[PDB]
RNA sequence: UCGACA
DNA sequence: ATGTCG
C-alpha cells in the first residue's frame, strides 16, 4: 500500500501569497536535510514553483549520479513535469518576467537531457505534511 | 453549467 | 488563487 520510499528527494514549494512570493527547497525524505533552496523570486504562482522544485531536483540527482525518486504533492507540476511543459495561466509581463524565465528554462532543460527519476505522487492525507514542506 | 481532486 | 479531470 504504496510504502514511503525513503531513499529520496523530496521538494515543495514555499510562498507568500498566490501569486506572490514564491520559493522552493528540495530536502532528504529520510533526513529532512535541505539539499537545495531557491533565492525568493518577486512573483509567481504556487504551481510555477511546485514545478521548478522538481525539475531542479531532477538536475540535482542527474549531476550526482543518484537514481533517487522525487517526491512531490503537487499533481499540477507532477503532470507539467511529464509533459515537459508547464501550462501556467500567470500573466507574461514586465513583473513576471523572472518567474516565466525561469519556467521556460526550466522546460528547455526538460527537452534538452534525459533522465530515470521516478517523480512520485507524495500524499499528504496520508503521511502527513511532505518533508520539504515550509 | 455542475462538481471531483491535487 | 493556481491547475487537472469528468
Ligand atoms: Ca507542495
Ligand atoms: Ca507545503
Known amino acids: 500500500k504504496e510504502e514511503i520510499i525513503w531513499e529520496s528527494l523530496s521538494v515543495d514549494v514555499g510562498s507568500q501569497g498566490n501569486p506572490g512570493i514564491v520559493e522552493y527547497k528540495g530536502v532528504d525524505t529520510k533526513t529532512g ?8 523570486i518577486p512573483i509567481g504562482t504556487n504551481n510555477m514553483g511546485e514545478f521548478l522544485a522538481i525539475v531542479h531536483g531532477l538536475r540535482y540527482l542527474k549531476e550526482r549520479n543518484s537514481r533517487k525518486p522525487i517526491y512531490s504533492d503537487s499533481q499540477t507540476a ?3 513535469v511529464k509533459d515537459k511543459k508547464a501550462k501556467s495561466t500567470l ?3 514586465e513583473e513576471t518576467a523572472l518567474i516565466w524565465k525561469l519556467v ?15 517523480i512520485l505522487k507524495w500524499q499528504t492525507d496520508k503521511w502527513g505534511a511532505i518533508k520539504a514542506d515550509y
Not at 536535510?33 to 525568493?40: A, G, S, T
Open 33 to 40: 536535510e535541505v539539499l537545495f533552496e531557491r533565492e525568493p
Open 78 to 80: 507532477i503532470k507539467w
Open 91 to 93: 500573466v507574461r509581463n
Open 104 to 118: 521556460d528554462e526550466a522546460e528547455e532543460w526538460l527537452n534538452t537531457h534525459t533522465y530515470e527519476t521516478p
